[PDB]
Amino acid sequence: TLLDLSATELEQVLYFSKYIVLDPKGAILNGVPVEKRQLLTDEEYRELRYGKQETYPLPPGVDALVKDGEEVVKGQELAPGVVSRLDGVALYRFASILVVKARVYPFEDDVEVSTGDRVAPGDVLADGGKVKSDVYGRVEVDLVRNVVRVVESYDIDARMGAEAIQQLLKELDLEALEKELLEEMKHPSRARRAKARKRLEVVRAFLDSGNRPEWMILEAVPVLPPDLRPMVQVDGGRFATSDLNDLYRRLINRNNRLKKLLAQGAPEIIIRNEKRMLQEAVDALLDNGRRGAPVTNPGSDRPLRSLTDILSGKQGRFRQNLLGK
Amino acid sequence: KISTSDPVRQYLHEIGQVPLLTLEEEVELARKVEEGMEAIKKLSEITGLDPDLIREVVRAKILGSARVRHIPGLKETLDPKTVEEIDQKLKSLPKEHKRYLHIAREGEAARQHLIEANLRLVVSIAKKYTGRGLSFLDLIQEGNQGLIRAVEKFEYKRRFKFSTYATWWIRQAINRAIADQARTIRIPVHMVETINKLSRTARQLQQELGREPTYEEIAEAMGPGWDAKRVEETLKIAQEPVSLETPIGDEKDSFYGDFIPDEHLPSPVDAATQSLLSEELEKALSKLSEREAMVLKLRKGLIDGEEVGAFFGVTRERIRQIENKALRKLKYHESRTRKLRDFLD
């Protein structure tokens, strides 16, 4: 409601999985300009940062009609058996061939720009000011074939998860959206004006009296007291503990495994995979069941109790559910 | 939607798009990885900088901007001013040493690439250590930390491929997680492989008797030092906790926690006890000679407390003297005005 994002599905889209919303700016196109607040898929996103990449086979024993650096021809058969997509150069280990969308800037004198630097048209690449890069994108200084290829992705803030929303949430000057809505409110027709009342309500209270909205995103999870989540000696050797402790472990373990995954090195499929798990866990202790239901282990396919629902059970609709001293 | 399928779709999509060509593709990445290592070490040599900083400064430029250094690791490395200053020194390295960062940058590039391509291998592996007490996703990911461990020690010089190598480094990581995390009360990897053998041994025993083995039979079957006292205990520690909050009696609305009494907290009866006890234990303490009464009162009542070391300067003959004479005068008058007689607790 506050952040104008499709209230329901636009969030679960970026929130729990990877559909990245372009946060500040992203110069390279999709066909159109930078989608200030719009969301894109990892497939098209992938198309946005490396550039374009399509590798293809060779029957046991055939030779390619193109050389090592001969720019692949837009719409050309690289080798007998395959038909490669448009912008590229042709590469090949002794089976398949590989296409690349960034243009080759052959250098013979040493390349001093380093792999990774953000580049804009002009940024030195190699052989002094002789080899200048004319397109926007990252740098890939290959030295087998002495060359400097410049990928076309300019820095596009594609981000997903509570990270993305935390940003968006800090950047809003509610007083702007207040005035902006006050006028969207009274002037246009009832369709877009109505939904604006609803959106002006939340923003009004945030500002009115009380606290500011950046806090809705959690980065520090409060832990309930211990004596309130006992560990006790039952009978014989049996120990009984508050369900909460099994959720807390989850969180703690995932949070830790996360850190260790960041430091060890970071294949990003693996970091998001866990950042998700982590999120789910952060939910679990708070409120279980609004999404997926946690179960310790076979014996009780019984939702582990959770803070949220402990409080509720207190005063909620049932005959007096758990009401009475 | 359902968190297993989109991740599976996620990396299975990537192994499909990037299956690693048997020999060649792994050969290149692997050798590139090792040249990164050497590069980094020779970099540390010429820069006087540690390898932890080279691995991380080269990781920053290849894997992520300020963003990744600031949030993951709090703040001891200014990502900009610090990382770019590091990059500086690397540039200065003439044609000669510069070649090593250029190599290091790919060294890692190649690294991540191989880890991506084999995420399939993990899931296929992880798939079988399913019902151990760990979440499919949790299992998959510690197995993942296992494949990374593998990438660090894989020596391509030794012709064998990363497949058979990742299998072992992965199964180890997984098994360790399962043991170390699966339970509420932590239990070391020995009690774990210990208890698993008990249950294993059990199943085999039931195959014969049609009698759930008496602990006598489990001791035997297990081996050298197994006795009843051992199996019984292990079967107790293996007994995981009971959920403090279970549906009790008729399932209606009955939580288990209401039934458990309190044991530190002094029920009113106790508050009354220690009231009189201290009130009148304090009356006796003041009316007595402080010399050996306070000695035994504070060396037994204040902090924990030794006869000779109990009295200040005066030896043991005056300790025993006043201790035993004051203690009895105190007890025999307390005998007259029976206040303490009714054994307080």
Q: What is the DSSP string of A28-46?
A: S-SSSS--TT-B--HHHHH
Question: Is the CATH code 1.10.10.10 the one for domain B266-342?
Answer: yes
Q: How far apart are CA A276 and CA A14, in angstroms?
A: 11
Residues of B in contact with A237 (CB under 8 A): 236-237, 239
Q: After which residues is chain A broken (C to N over 2.5 A)?
A: 94
Cα–chain center distance at A105? 33
- The answer on A279 and A211 residing in a single domain is yes
Domain count across chain A: 3
Cα–chain center distance at B60? 30
Could you tell me if A24 and A219 are in contact, meaning their C-beta atoms sit under 8 angstroms apart? no
Q: How far apart are CA A115 and CA B102, in angstroms?
A: 7
Hey, are the CB atoms on A273 and B68 less than 8 Å from each other? no
Highest CATH level, class, for B187-240: mainly alpha
Q: How far apart are CA B300 and CA B246, in angstroms?
A: 44
Q: How far apart are CA B1 and CA A18, in angstroms?
A: 12
In which element (H, E) is residue A139 found?
strand A139-140
Residue A49, class by beta-carbon neighbours within 10 Å (0-12 exposed, 13-18 middle, 19+ buried)? middle
Residue showing tokens 């290592």 = B37
Parent domain of A304 = 1-52+153-325
Highest CATH level, class, for B1-183: mainly alpha
Instruction: Tell me the CATH number at A136.
Output: 2.40.50.100
In which element (H, E) is residue A126 found?
strand A124-126
Residue A240's φ and ψ, nearest 5 degrees, are -120, 130
- The answer on A241 and A317 residing in a single domain is yes
Min CA distance, B321 vs chain A (Å)? 46
- The answer on A107 and A37 residing in a single domain is no
User: Which of B52, B141, B154, B259 to mutate: most A Cβ within 10 Å?
Assistant: B141
Residues of B in contact with A96 (CB under 8 A): 21
- The answer on A256 and A213 residing in a single domain is yes
Nearest CA in chain A to B186: A249
- The answer on A73 and A204 residing in a single domain is no
Hey, are the CB atoms on B181 and A253 less than 8 Å from each other? yes
- The answer on A118 and A265 residing in a single domain is no
A191 touches chain B (CB under 8 A): no
- Residue A147 carries which DSSP code? -
Could you tell me if B304 and B296 are in contact, meaning their C-beta atoms sit under 8 angstroms apart? no
- The answer on A283 and A251 residing in a single domain is yes
- The answer on A198 and A94 residing in a single domain is no
A302 touches chain B (CB under 8 A): yes
Select from B21, B145, B243 the Cβ nearest to the Cβ of A300.
B243
Could you tell me if A64 and A82 are in contact, meaning their C-beta atoms sit under 8 angstroms apart? no
Print burial letters for B296-328: b (CB count within 10 Å at least 16), e (below 16).
Answer: bbebeeeeeeeeeebbeeeeeeebeebbeebee
The candidate with the shortest Cα–Cα distance to A276, out of A292, A287, A296, A300, is: A292
Experimental technique, in short, is X-ray
- Residue A71 carries which DSSP code? P
- The answer on A182 and A244 residing in a single domain is yes
Q: How far apart are CA A59 and CA B328, in angstroms?
A: 107
Domain spans in chain B, listed from the N-terminal domain onward: 1-183, 187-240, 266-342
Nearest CA in chain A to B61: A116
Resolution (A): 2.7
Could you tell me if A40 and A28 are in contact, meaning their C-beta atoms sit under 8 angstroms apart? no
Let me know if the fold of B187-240 is the same as that of B266-342: yes
- The answer on A70 and A17 residing in a single domain is no
Q: Is the dihedral of CA A192, A193, A194, A198 positive or negative?
A: positive
Q: Is the dihedral of CA B267, B271, B277, B282 positive or negative?
A: positive
